[PDB]
Design a protein around this ligand. Structure first.
Ligand SMILES: Nc1ncnc2c1ncn2[C@@H]1O[C@H](COP(=O)(O)OP(=O)(O)O)[C@@H](O)[C@H]1O
Ligand SMILES: Nc1ncnc2c1ncn2[C@@H]1O[C@H](COP(=O)(O)OP(=O)(O)O)[C@@H](O)[C@H]1O
Ligand SMILES: NC(=O)CC[C@H](N)C(=O)O
Ligand SMILES: NC(=O)CC[C@H](N)C(=O)O
Ligand SMILES: CC[N+](CC)(CC)CC
Ligand SMILES: NCCC[C@H](N)C(=O)O
Ligand SMILES: [Cl-]
Ligand SMILES: [Cl-]
Ligand SMILES: [Cl-]
Ligand SMILES: [Cl-]
Ligand SMILES: [Cl-]
Ligand SMILES: [Cl-]
Ligand SMILES: [Cl-]
Ligand SMILES: [K+]
Ligand SMILES: [K+]
Ligand SMILES: [K+]
Ligand SMILES: [K+]
Ligand SMILES: [K+]
Ligand SMILES: [K+]
Ligand SMILES: [K+]
Ligand SMILES: [Mn+2]
Ligand SMILES: [Mn+2]
Ligand SMILES: [Mn+2]
Ligand SMILES: [Mn+2]
Lengths: 379, 1057
């Protein structure tokens, strides 16, 4: 018997089986509707301090492999699923899910009513919780930890995941045929982009390289100054965990960049930041956007995209300065999804154009960024 | 973007009669397309020869045509109705093909009819195999190595390049029709010949084998604004090589990584774009090499399908509904998602928090000499679907809802059989309809997963789960009921284990296992389908059972509920006809204010559509499943009479367990159903019945037989001619009955409320008694029976209604011999002819009877008089012989038909002509007829030859038949039997000398020797009649013109006094 238990702040208990590391895990609980891509999800830094619940019952069907790691590690605090398959069945698999979780010392539970969990989260909203895996997990104690959890609202997690030192990235996208390409030389990549690491996913980088971009990944707290000193063709603001708001250092820099004519594009957190930096306000979502089937409309072109989401906070459009134009909107709830500055070469998108996992539908987003860059390199 | 102003009216092409590979899925879809366009203010016109459809119900469209699906016939509908547009994607292959004929024939131009949904060019790009493959080249997708062939010589060249085994697939066909896998030149030749001639464009695509690769399907939807969504992904359990329609399949895909999935998804979209589908749905098929993920595109179907219907059921997203709207200009963003109460658009990709499993239903036992191995040509007759929270649960539930008597992984082979492993091995290596079961048995016998993988090519992801269930079963047998502690029981229940399966393993009654669960507070909870994995609330009650924590049933307290039990998967003799009835009970009662609850698991029908009832429990129709629903709903009544055999067989047990079965009681039913009980009733009432007995031993037979007199009906029904003939049976081989030779069979459908009896319809079959009613063409009104004789029947039915205490529907079968009425059988429930009668008579018998069952008298309804329409209505069937070539295409006491058609005319001959053409008959009004009848028909055949000569037919005849003709002044050209010389009948058939054949036979021997005539006629598409009555009917039809006039159902109905 390998017991595990999950308790939410409200006392709701979920008894099941331990599939990961023995221990306890605490964080804000979320549900992701994605049918595939659990690994990518696990390793996405945006999940820092979050207990990820997956709605699709069978998780680990294809085991795991390195190409499917969206970062150096698993950032989810915990993992909650209904069923851990008896085996992984896929030619790309290098390690079954249990072993991999244990390997990354992640506390995980299976065998629980994940749909009950999902509906609770949807109706009452996000809730903090704790998982205890081990001999006789103490529910009172799980309740305690779940209650002690400080909450993600007002929490700057970007500074927590960011890179100590700045590095270069010159590797592109994986291919069935070739797999993950070798890192390119610098004289190959035409442009130079500076990407602020706020818990950046490998994919966005790769996708940037793909479009001729040589990258310089700088710590989250990098100053505009030392940035403007690199003669950046463009400036990128990565996705990342927690509240964007408490990120003063980012807002300041960004505001500085925006005094410039250098092009700026941000995704997810980056997007939020850019909005905050422009005088826009951010809000915490009841339950957030976590799935890979999110319809997003490009209001300009009147077209729809299926997109990958992963955000607990959003930009209040009713607080949008008049310099920020609404480019995209969620077809599910009406929430703001993309913005462009009427005065500067700055645009951002809430969803994940890089996907991984998910529909490739918002990839063309990168393109406008590149356009701007080429144009910047014009003048 | 919004609806189209240039289009006021729309013609929707129906699918026609139910056939293997093209079934009930088209009524579900067609019904949805009608519903959707009618909600939008569009004029709806549609054509469907199949009367047993909800889509042909009068109130569902403006102008409904139950006429043969022939271009010339449609043309008459166009002419008359003048449709602005035509939607050809809702009716299977039949609609695609008709649409293109009408194009080709210039009818679309003639009448300025616009083709919506899919264009003729898109359709062809997809259906023409050459074109599709070229299309792939264009978009950079890969296809297996293949070659086109328009001739047999072309075909062998291709076989030589790709090698054996090779796969053959004709252009313009689906469901694997005309195709197959060839392992040798012999099979190559037989299949290529069949495909060549069955293909509407006479072309075959021949491919290298990808047998064993994984098989996937995706359902795609696209709008005019180019928005594109994947509605559902499907992973086949059975690998490449077994048609998807004959395979077990699951949703969503399970073994693809996200990276692979996106490649697949993207490919899917590129396919649609390239083929040219911009306003509607399409299914894309692929093959994936498990070893390296190599993706190969297989085909694409530019219309709704059996997968789109399964996809809709699986996800809760109504594809057909949405596609209809999309054909009239709507876009996905503008349409609202039904099951999330419209708070979300249709522009999204569903997400499911459960596992959906489909298992095909077969009927091999009906076609004994047929090859029973699964291949690329579909052979299944229906399908079951189940929803579970895990694959295991999903799979066992589906097995128990299959209506094959399984309770899950029931063993097929005993552990102590020394050759057991050999049989198992054969069954795994070359799959039959029972493979699933053999898989568990291999594990019971010690075969490893790898061992099984190697033989079946079934992904180990699935195999391991089956192996696990086996080990669990092993444990239950070991510990018994004693070891079934609350914790273990819960575990087993959560794996799908049926109480019956557990009782069997543990050696106790199922009821004891059921009681045990109550003890431990172990009842399932119900979860809801919502298309979004609980992301959004739903106001819909579409549920499935599961062993989890929270329940979403939330049964109302407020109202009066009526539950309707469906029949599960379709099978021969258990068709869409019962489902129509079920639907009708629910629509009527709901309209009446009752809250209705449908219990069914067939994904192809309207009964399982969420709009059909207040509450839908998509579950196995079993005692266990139903009991759990009643437990929580506490309905006022439960209808057991409309779903066919399935529910019928549960009535006694339901009642026993305390269910409020309304309508005709389970004992009353059994009274009828019971041979003993019955034979008594018949006497009591002083009614005529064939002479019968119940023999145990042979020699008791001969005697009893000598006494009842031959011919005899031996209840696998055979007709034994003589004593010598009986042993013959006896050996090869109990109810014994005197066969009523040269008798007119009749079907009477009626309603009894305890107060009165309403005669629904009196139907005279064309084929005589001895040819199953289910396979007989029939007439309404009767075309030869005397008012007098019929009045007798009428009275005889009324007598039986009261006697058995019928409450609702009933059907009585008679035989009229020598102006004398005899009783064949009483079916105190809804019969398969109901929808036919309803359509012919405009009276909705299933609705009336439902009300009656619920408590509204006939009186009360204003339904008291029997309706004799002014016109003639004829029903004809479609037989699946072409799908099992090795079978003798001959009629008999056992039912084998899959579907039916309706013909309406001013004369019986007109109606019969319409039935005939609607049934896909190849009969012509010229040429040469072949007459080869038996003794008893020789005399009567004279008049038939006269008729034909009179219609301009030349005549050929076999020796004996020519003799008698000659003796009556008719000199046919003689033909040799095969043993007689050359050329013989077969050479002539093969050589196209005949346009029509009449071949009647008697005797096991005789039949066996004449087999070549019938197999030949079938193979060569020559219209043939195996009964003189059929002959006479066909002869009359010759004086009719099935294309002359058309009439709508509404028009039919108004014409009624
Ligand atoms: N190259 C192949 N090797 C093995 N099986 C194949 C191959 N191509 C197709 N099949 C099988 O043939 C079945 C029928 O082919 P398909 O193109 O779907 O025709 P249809 O339109 O009649 O349904 C598929 O469901 C699949 O299992
Ligand atoms: N005594 C009989 N004489 C002649 N034909 C019979 C007789 N009994 C049955 N048949 C034929 O067999 C068919 C099936 O008989 P029935 O008793 O109704 O079986 P089922 O249960 O399949 O309906 C009838 O529709 C009829 O054509
Ligand atoms: N199960 C129900 O009764 C549905 C309740 C509610 N609308 C929901 O979506 O949760
Ligand atoms: N009535 C029949 O069908 C005659 C038998 C058949 N022609 C034979 O070759 O034996
Ligand atoms: C599959 C249905 N048919 C081809 C479209 C053959 C029965 C109708 C003629
Ligand atoms: N109603 C049965 C189909 C008729 C077929 N032509 C036969 O006479 O055998
Ligand atoms: Cl739980
Ligand atoms: Cl036609
Ligand atoms: Cl076809
Ligand atoms: Cl390969
Ligand atoms: Cl066969
Ligand atoms: Cl135990
Ligand atoms: Cl019936
Ligand atoms: K549990
Ligand atoms: K038109
Ligand atoms: K096709
Ligand atoms: K090819
Ligand atoms: K298959
Ligand atoms: K298919
Ligand atoms: K008959
Ligand atoms: Mn097809
Ligand atoms: Mn197919
Ligand atoms: Mn019968
Ligand atoms: Mn019967």
């Amino acid at each position: 018997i390998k017991s595990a238990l999950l308790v939410l702040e409200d006392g709701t208990q979920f008894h099941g089986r331990a599939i990961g590391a023995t221990g306890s895990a605490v964080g804000e609980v979320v549900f992701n509707t994605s049918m595939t891509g659990y690994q990518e999800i696990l390793t996405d830094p945006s999940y820092s301090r979050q207990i990820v619940t997956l709605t699709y019952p069978h998780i680990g069907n294809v085991g795991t492999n390195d190409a499917d790691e969206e970062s150096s590690q698993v950032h989810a605090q915990g993992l909650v699923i209904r069923d851990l398959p008896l085996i992984a069945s896929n030619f790309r698999n290098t390690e079954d899910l249990s072993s991999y979780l244990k390997r990354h010392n992640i506390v995980a539970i299976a065998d629980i009513d994940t749909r009950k969990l999902t509906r609770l989260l949807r109706e009452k909203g996000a809730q903090n919780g704790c998982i205890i895996a081990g001999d006789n997990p103490d529910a009172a104690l799980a309740l305690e930890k779940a209650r002690a959890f400080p909450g993600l609202n007002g929490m700057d997690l970007a500074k927590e995941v960011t890179t100590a030192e700045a590095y270069s990235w010159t590797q592109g996208s994986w291919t069935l045929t070739g797999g993950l390409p070798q890192a390119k030389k610098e004289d190959e990549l035409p442009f130079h982009v500076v990407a602020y690491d706020f818990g950046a996913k490998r994919n966005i980088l790769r996708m940037l390289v793909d479009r001729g971009c040589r990258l310089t990944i700088v710590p989250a707290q990098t100053s505009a100054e030392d940035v403007l000193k690199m003669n950046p063709d463009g400036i990128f603001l990565s996705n990342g965990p927690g509240d964007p708001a408490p990120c003063d250092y980012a807002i300041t820099a960004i505001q500085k960049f925006l005094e410039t004519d250098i092009p700026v594009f941000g995704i997810c957190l980056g997007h939020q930041l850019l909005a905050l930096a422009s005088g826009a306000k951010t809000v915490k979502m009841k339950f957030g956007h976590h799935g890979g089937n999110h319809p997003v409309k490009d209001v300009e072109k009147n077209v729809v995209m299926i997109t990958a989401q992963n955000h607990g906070f959003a930009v209040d459009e009713a607080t949008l300065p008049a310099n920020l134009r609404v480019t995209h909107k969620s077809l599910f709830d009406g929430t703001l999804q993309g913005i462009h500055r009427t005065d500067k070469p700055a645009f951002s998108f809430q969803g994940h154009p890089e996907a991984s996992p998910g529909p490739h539908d918002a990839a063309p987003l990168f393109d406008h960024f590149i356009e701007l860059i080429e144009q910047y390199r014009k003048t | 973007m919004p609806k189209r102003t240039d289009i006021k009216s729309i013609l929707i092409l129906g699918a026609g009669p139910i056939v293997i590979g093209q079934a009930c899925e088209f009524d579900y879809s067609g019904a949805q397309a009608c519903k959707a366009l009618r909600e939008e203010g569009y004029r709806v016109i549609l054509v469907n020869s199949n009367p047993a459809t909800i889509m042909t119900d009068p109130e569902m469209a403006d102008a409904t045509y139950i006429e043969p699906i022939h271009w010339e016939v449609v043309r008459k509908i166009i002419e008359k109705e003048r449709p602005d547009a035509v939607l050809p994607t809702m009716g299977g292959q039949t609609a695609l093909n008709c649409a293109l004929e009408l194009e080709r024939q210039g009818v679309l131009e003639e009448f300025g009819v616009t083709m919506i949904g899919a264009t003729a060019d898109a359709i062809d790009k997809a259906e023409d195999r050459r074109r599709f493959d070229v299309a792939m080249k264009k978009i950079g997708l890969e296809t297996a190595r293949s070659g086109i062939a328009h001739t047999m010589e072309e075909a062998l060249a291709v076989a030589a390049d790709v090698g054996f085994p090779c796969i053959i697939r004709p252009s313009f066909t689906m469901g694997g029709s005309g195709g197959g896998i060839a392992y040798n030149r012999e099979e190559f030749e037989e299949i290529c010949a069949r495909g060549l001639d069955l293909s509407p464009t006479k072309e075959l695509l021949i491919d290298e084998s990808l047998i064993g690769w994984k098989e996937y399907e995706m359902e795609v939807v696209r709008d005019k604004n180019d928005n594109c969504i994947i509605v559902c992904s499907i992973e086949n359990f059975d690998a490449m090589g077994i048609h998807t329609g004959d395979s077990i399949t699951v949703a969503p895909a399970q073994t693809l990584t996200d990276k692979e999935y996106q490649i697949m998804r993207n490919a899917s979209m590129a396919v649609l774009r390239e083929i040219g589908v911009e306003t509607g749905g399409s299914n894309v098929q692929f093959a994936v090499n498990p070893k390296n993920g190599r993706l190969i595109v297989i085909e694409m179907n530019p219309r709704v399908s059996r997968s789109s219907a399964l996809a809709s059921k699986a996800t809760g997203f109504p594809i057909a509904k949405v596609a209809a709207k999309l054909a009239v200009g709507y876009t996905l963003d503008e349409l609202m998602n039904d099951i999330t109460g419209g708070r979300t658009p249709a522009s999204f990709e569903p997400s499911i928090d459960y596992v959906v499993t489909k298992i095909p239903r077969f009927n091999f036992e009906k076609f004994a000499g047929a090859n029973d191995r699964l291949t690329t040509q579909m052979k299944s007759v229906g399908e079951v679907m189940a929803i579970g929270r895990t694959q295991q649960e999903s799979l066992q539930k589906a097995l128990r809802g299959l209506e094959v008597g399984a309770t899950g992984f029931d063993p097929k082979v005993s552990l102590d059989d020394p050759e057991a492993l050999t049989k198992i091995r054969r069954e795994l290596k070359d799959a039959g309809a029972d493979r699933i079961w053999y898989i568990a048995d291999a594990f019971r016998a010690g075969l490893s997963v790898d061992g099984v993988f190697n033989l079946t090519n079934i992904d180990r992801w699935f195999l391991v789960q089956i192996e696990e269930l086996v080990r669990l079963e092993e444990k239950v047998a070991e510990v018994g009921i004693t070891g079934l502690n609350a914790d273990f029981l819960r575990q087993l229940k959560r794996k799908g284990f049926a109480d019956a399966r557990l009782a069997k393993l543990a050696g106790v009654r199922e009821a004891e296992i059921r009681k045990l669960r109550d003890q431990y507070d172990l009842h399932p909870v119900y979860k809801r389908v919502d298309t979004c994995a609980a992301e959004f609330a739903t106001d819909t009650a579409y549920m499935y059972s599961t062993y989890e924590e929270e329940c979403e049933a939330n049964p109302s307290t407020d109202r009066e509920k009526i539950m309707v039990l469906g029949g599960g998967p379709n099978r021969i003799g258990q068709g869409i006809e019962f489902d129509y009835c079920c639907v009708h009970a629910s629509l009527a009662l709901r309209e009446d204010g009752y809250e209705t609850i449908m219990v069914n698991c067939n994904p192809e029908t309207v009964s399982t559509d969420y709009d059909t009832s207040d509450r839908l429990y998509f579950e196995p129709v079993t005692l266990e499943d139903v009991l759990e629903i009643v437990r929580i709903e506490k309905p006022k009544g439960v209808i057991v009479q409309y779903g066919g055999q399935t529910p019928l067989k549960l009535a006694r047990a339901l009642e026993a367990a305390g269910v409020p079965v309304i309508g005709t009681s389970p004992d009353a039913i059994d009274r009828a159903e019971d041979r003993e009980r019955f034979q008594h009733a018949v006497e009591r009432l002083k009614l005529k019945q064939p002479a019968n007995a119940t023999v145990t031993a042979i020699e008791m037979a001969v005697e009893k037989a000598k006494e009842i007199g031959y011919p005899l009906v031996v209840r696998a029904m055979e007709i034994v001619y003589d004593e010598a003939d009986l042993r013959r049976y006896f050996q090869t081989a109990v109810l014994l009955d005197h066969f009523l030779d040269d008798a007119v069979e009749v079907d009477v459908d009626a309603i009894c409320d305890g107060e009165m009896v309403l005669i629904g319809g009196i139907m005279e079959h064309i084929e005589q008694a001895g040819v199953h009613s289910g396979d007989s063409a029939c007439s309404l009104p009767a075309y030869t029976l005397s008012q007098e004789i019929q009045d007798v029947m009428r009275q005889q039915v009324q007598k039986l209604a009261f006697e058995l205490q019928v409450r609702g529907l009933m059907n009585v079968q008679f035989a009229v011999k020598n102006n004398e009425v005899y009783l064949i059988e009483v079916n105190p429930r809804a019969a398969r002819t109901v929808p036919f009668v309803s359509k012919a008579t405009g009276v909705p018998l299933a609705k009336v009877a439902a009300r009656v069952m619920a408590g509204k008298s006939l009186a009360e309804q204003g339904v008291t008089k029997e309706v004799i329409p002014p016109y003639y209505s004829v029903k004809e069937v479609v037989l699946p012989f072409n799908k099992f070539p090795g079978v003798d295409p001959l009629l008999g006491p056992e039912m084998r038909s899959t579907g039916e058609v309706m013909g309406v005319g001013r004369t019986f001959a007109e109606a019969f002509a319409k039935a005939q053409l609607g049934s896909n008959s190849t009969m012509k009004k010229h040429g040469r007829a072949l007459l080869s009848v038996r003794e008893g028909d020789k005399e009567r055949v004279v008049d038939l030859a006269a008729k034909l000569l009179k219609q301009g037919f030349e005549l050929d005849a076999t020796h004996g038949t020519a003799i008698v003709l000659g003796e009556a002044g008719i000199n046919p050209r003689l033909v040799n039997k095969v043993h007689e010389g050359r050329p013989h009948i077969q050479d002539r058939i093969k050589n196209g000398e005949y346009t029509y054949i009449i071949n009647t036979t008697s005797g096991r021997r005789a039949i066996e020797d004449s087999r070549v005539i019938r197999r030949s006629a079938l193979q060569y598409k020559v219209h043939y009649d195996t009964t003189l009555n059929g002959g006479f009917a066909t002869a009359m039809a010759l004086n009719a013109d099935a294309t002359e006039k058309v009439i709508s159902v509404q028009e039919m109905h108004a014409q009624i006094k």
